[PDB]
Design an enzyme around this catalytic site. Structure first.
Site, PDB file in Angstrom:
ATOM      1  N   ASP A 163      13.538  26.633  18.726  1.00 50.64           N
ATOM      2  CA  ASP A 163      13.815  26.936  20.075  1.00 50.64           C
ATOM      3  C   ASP A 163      12.765  26.804  20.530  1.00 50.64           C
ATOM      4  O   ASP A 163      11.660  26.759  20.387  1.00 50.64           O
ATOM      5  CB  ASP A 163      13.967  27.782  20.063  1.00 50.64           C
ATOM      6  CG  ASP A 163      14.668  28.049  21.932  1.00 50.64           C
ATOM      7  OD1 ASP A 163      16.320  27.327  22.037  1.00 50.64           O
ATOM      8  OD2 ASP A 163      13.952  27.682  23.421  1.00 50.64           O
ATOM      9  N   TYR A 198       7.027  24.054  26.790  1.00 55.49           N
ATOM     10  CA  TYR A 198       6.912  24.697  26.249  1.00 55.49           C
ATOM     11  C   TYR A 198       5.526  24.513  25.789  1.00 55.49           C
ATOM     12  O   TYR A 198       4.417  24.604  24.831  1.00 55.49           O
ATOM     13  CB  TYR A 198       7.066  25.365  24.766  1.00 55.49           C
ATOM     14  CG  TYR A 198       8.423  26.358  26.159  1.00 55.49           C
ATOM     15  CD1 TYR A 198       8.927  26.597  26.990  1.00 55.49           C
ATOM     16  CD2 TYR A 198       9.656  26.549  24.299  1.00 55.49           C
ATOM     17  CE1 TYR A 198      10.226  27.556  27.052  1.00 55.49           C
ATOM     18  CE2 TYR A 198      10.876  27.115  24.435  1.00 55.49           C
ATOM     19  CZ  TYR A 198      11.087  27.546  26.443  1.00 55.49           C
ATOM     20  OH  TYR A 198      12.158  28.230  27.189  1.00 55.49           O
ATOM     21  N   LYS A 241      14.555  20.566  25.173  1.00 52.10           N
ATOM     22  CA  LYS A 241      15.244  20.951  26.384  1.00 52.10           C
ATOM     23  C   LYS A 241      14.715  20.147  27.384  1.00 52.10           C
ATOM     24  O   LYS A 241      12.560  19.372  27.309  1.00 52.10           O
ATOM     25  CB  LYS A 241      14.782  22.031  27.425  1.00 52.10           C
ATOM     26  CG  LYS A 241      15.513  23.781  26.301  1.00 52.10           C
ATOM     27  CD  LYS A 241      15.007  25.161  26.567  1.00 52.10           C
ATOM     28  CE  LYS A 241      15.523  25.342  25.634  1.00 52.10           C
ATOM     29  NZ  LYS A 241      14.318  26.795  24.953  1.00 52.10           N
ATOM     30  N   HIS A 298      17.088  22.696  30.443  1.00 47.83           N
ATOM     31  CA  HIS A 298      16.397  23.647  31.105  1.00 47.83           C
ATOM     32  C   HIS A 298      17.046  24.453  31.843  1.00 47.83           C
ATOM     33  O   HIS A 298      17.033  25.757  31.427  1.00 47.83           O
ATOM     34  CB  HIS A 298      15.096  23.236  30.884  1.00 47.83           C
ATOM     35  CG  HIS A 298      14.303  24.299  30.760  1.00 47.83           C
ATOM     36  ND1 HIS A 298      13.156  23.876  29.344  1.00 47.83           N
ATOM     37  CD2 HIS A 298      14.434  25.780  30.573  1.00 47.83           C
ATOM     38  CE1 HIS A 298      12.881  24.921  29.483  1.00 47.83           C
ATOM     39  NE2 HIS A 298      13.569  26.390  29.665  1.00 47.83           N
TER      40      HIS A 298
HETATM   41  N1  LIG Z   1      16.206  28.493  28.708  1.00 43.90           N
HETATM   42  C1  LIG Z   1      15.468  29.528  29.203  1.00 43.90           C
HETATM   43  O1  LIG Z   1      14.952  29.655  30.423  1.00 43.90           O
HETATM   44  C2  LIG Z   1      13.968  30.373  28.955  1.00 43.90           C
HETATM   45  C3  LIG Z   1      14.140  30.497  27.171  1.00 43.90           C
HETATM   46  N2  LIG Z   1      12.841  31.362  25.744  1.00 43.90           N
HETATM   47  C4  LIG Z   1      13.139  30.911  25.009  1.00 43.90           C
HETATM   48  O2  LIG Z   1      13.561  31.544  24.356  1.00 43.90           O
HETATM   49  C5  LIG Z   1      12.370  32.828  23.815  1.00 43.90           C
HETATM   50  C6  LIG Z   1      12.625  34.391  24.381  1.00 43.90           C
HETATM   51  O3  LIG Z   1      12.151  35.552  23.735  1.00 43.90           O
HETATM   52  P1  LIG Z   1      10.603  35.801  25.311  1.00 43.90           P
HETATM   53  O4  LIG Z   1      10.779  35.762  26.345  1.00 43.90           O
HETATM   54  O5  LIG Z   1       9.671  35.034  25.053  1.00 43.90           O
HETATM   55  O6  LIG Z   1      10.427  37.365  25.234  1.00 43.90           O
HETATM   56  P2  LIG Z   1      10.985  38.407  23.661  1.00 43.90           P
HETATM   57  O7  LIG Z   1      12.387  38.958  24.530  1.00 43.90           O
HETATM   58  O8  LIG Z   1      11.314  37.360  22.736  1.00 43.90           O
HETATM   59  O9  LIG Z   1       9.836  39.382  23.369  1.00 43.90           O
HETATM   60  C7  LIG Z   1       8.334  38.608  23.667  1.00 43.90           C
HETATM   61  C8  LIG Z   1       7.570  39.580  22.965  1.00 43.90           C
HETATM   62  O10 LIG Z   1       8.570  40.854  22.242  1.00 43.90           O
HETATM   63  C9  LIG Z   1       6.856  41.417  20.907  1.00 43.90           C
HETATM   64  N3  LIG Z   1       8.021  41.092  19.860  1.00 43.90           N
HETATM   65  C10 LIG Z   1       8.501  40.361  18.764  1.00 43.90           C
HETATM   66  N4  LIG Z   1       9.035  40.993  17.979  1.00 43.90           N
HETATM   67  C11 LIG Z   1       8.850  42.122  17.882  1.00 43.90           C
HETATM   68  C12 LIG Z   1       9.176  43.274  17.310  1.00 43.90           C
HETATM   69  N5  LIG Z   1       9.672  43.264  15.684  1.00 43.90           N
HETATM   70  N6  LIG Z   1       8.603  44.770  17.179  1.00 43.90           N
HETATM   71  C13 LIG Z   1       7.761  44.380  18.899  1.00 43.90           C
HETATM   72  N7  LIG Z   1       7.177  43.563  19.048  1.00 43.90           N
HETATM   73  C14 LIG Z   1       8.035  42.282  19.594  1.00 43.90           C
HETATM   74  C15 LIG Z   1       6.195  39.701  21.071  1.00 43.90           C
HETATM   75  O11 LIG Z   1       4.758  40.188  20.636  1.00 43.90           O
HETATM   76  P3  LIG Z   1       4.373  39.623  19.762  1.00 43.90           P
HETATM   77  O12 LIG Z   1       4.192  37.984  20.402  1.00 43.90           O
HETATM   78  O13 LIG Z   1       2.565  39.990  20.150  1.00 43.90           O
HETATM   79  O14 LIG Z   1       4.548  39.390  18.231  1.00 43.90           O
HETATM   80  C16 LIG Z   1       6.043  39.236  22.218  1.00 43.90           C
HETATM   81  O15 LIG Z   1       5.453  39.518  23.360  1.00 43.90           O
HETATM   82  C17 LIG Z   1      10.903  31.903  24.088  1.00 43.90           C
HETATM   83  O16 LIG Z   1      10.219  31.855  22.902  1.00 43.90           O
HETATM   84  C18 LIG Z   1      12.150  31.009  24.359  1.00 43.90           C
HETATM   85  O17 LIG Z   1      11.516  29.954  22.688  1.00 43.90           O
HETATM   86  C19 LIG Z   1      12.103  31.842  27.359  1.00 43.90           C
HETATM   87  C20 LIG Z   1      12.530  32.465  28.853  1.00 43.90           C
HETATM   88  C21 LIG Z   1      13.190  31.492  29.609  1.00 43.90           C
END
Ligand SMILES: NC(=O)C1=CN([C@@H]2O[C@H](COP(=O)(O)OP(=O)(O)OC[C@H]3O[C@@H](n4cnc5c(N)ncnc54)[C@H](OP(=O)(O)O)[C@@H]3O)[C@@H](O)[C@H]2O)C=CC1
Ligand SMILES: [Ca+2]
Length: 327
Positions: A53, A58, A87, A120
């Protein structure tokens, strides 16, 4: 190594039930972890992830497309095995601009087409913060245009509320394939989810861990945290971690997840969620965490027409949400 099942879209195509998120955060956009993102991506593809995604916003489309091309060169996948989403942001909401935004994203990514392209957000906002007051129906004509031109195999939306979904479904010629929105244990979005699924629109959950994980757990954000006794207990019962319970719950609601991580062990862990059925009791417990707490609520967009969420009365868009460079 991992076997990710697929959901079926209302246009005949499949979408893998779990995907790899690529947003690094305004935590001032933070480029530091790009290399870790890429190396964890390459690993994700090696073990069996196919859904990626991403978005213009991004910043990392050029780097993702390079990884993709390498994995194809190494023979790990073919193009046709991958599901890639991008997006179009808020300054490209005129119909003719969707083609410009998406062709550029496609050049960055090095692709003939994406599998899915999303609106988006439903707001139309200039790069200087002017509300352009363009109806998302007009924007959607451009999504329908880039679909007919073969630039994408599917069109969808993100952050549309039930009213926006309804109005879009009543007026479009081609329906959205997905509505990508925040879904997690504190924000279940039951009514929006039911409405989408009753209309054969697939729901894709961003921020699927909500504030459960320590990176986002600011004080007085709600349970569950990773130490939650009921989560751990559901865990021990099916032999899973707490994050795995969380993703498996979404899977079991028929909702696609796009967790983000730069850590390979989490990449692997996040994918090992398709081999257990949560029973009625554990589903009921997990449903008790729902309390309307929204992890992603960009208050700077409240005054714009089509802002999708409930407005908190009595409240400047940061530059990093309007102007940036890619690669
Ligand atoms: N359409 C929209 O408006 C939006 C879309 N998005 C999209 O969706 C994704 C959504 O996720 P996001 O909002 O980043 O947050 P998430 O809920 O995916 O959580 C991200 C965090 O969780 C940690 N993490 C991931 N897996 C684990 C695990 N198994 N155990 C413990 N910690 C974990 C990561 O740490 P680390 O990286 O340090 O491992 C990171 O800091 C984005 O990357 C993007 O692609 C997001 C926001 C808005
Ligand atoms: Ca292609």
């Amino acid at each position: 190594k991992v076997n990710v099942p697929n959901f079926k879209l209302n246009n005949g195509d499949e979408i893998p039930a779990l995907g790899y998120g690529t947003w690094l955060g305004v935590s001032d956009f933070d480029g530091t972890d790009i290399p870790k993102l890429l190396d964890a991506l390459s690993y994700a593809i090696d073990i069996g992830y196919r859904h990626i995604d991403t978005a213009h916003f991004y910043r990392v489309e050029p780097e993702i497309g390079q990884v993709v091309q390498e994995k194809i060169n190494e023979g790990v996948v073919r193009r046709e095995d991958l599901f890639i989403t991008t997006k179009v942001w808020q300054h490209y909401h005129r119909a003719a601009d969707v083609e410009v935004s998406l062709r550029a994203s496609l050049h960055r990514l090095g692709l003939d087409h994406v599998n899915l392209v999303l609106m988006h957000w439903p707001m139309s906002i200039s790069q200087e913060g002017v509300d352009e007051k363009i109806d998302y129906l007009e924007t959607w004509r451009g999504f329908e245009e880039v679909l007919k031109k073969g630039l994408t195999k599917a069109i969808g939306v993100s952050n549309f509320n039930i009213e926006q979904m309804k109005r879009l479904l009543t007026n479009c010629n081609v329906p959205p394939a997905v509505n990508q929105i925040e879904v997690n244990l504190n924000l279940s979005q039951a009514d929006l989810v039911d409405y989408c699924q009753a209309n054969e629109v697939v729901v894709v959950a961003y921020s699927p861990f909500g504030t459960m994980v320590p990176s986002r757990a600011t004080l007085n954000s709600p349970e569950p945290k990773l130490d939650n006794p009921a989560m751990l207990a559901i865990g021990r019962k099916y032999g899973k971690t707490v994050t795995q319970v969380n993703l498996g719950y979404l899977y079991q609601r028929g909702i696609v997840s796009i967790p983000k991580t730069v850590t390979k062990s989490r990449v692997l862990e996040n994918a090992s969620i398709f081999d257990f059925q949560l029973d009625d009791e554990d589903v009921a417990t997990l449903a008790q965490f729902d309390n309307g707490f929204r992890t992603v609520r960009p208050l700077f967009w409240q005054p714009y027409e089509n802002y999708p969420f409930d407005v908190v009365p009595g409240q400047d868009i940061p530059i990093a949400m309007r102007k940036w460079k890619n690669g």
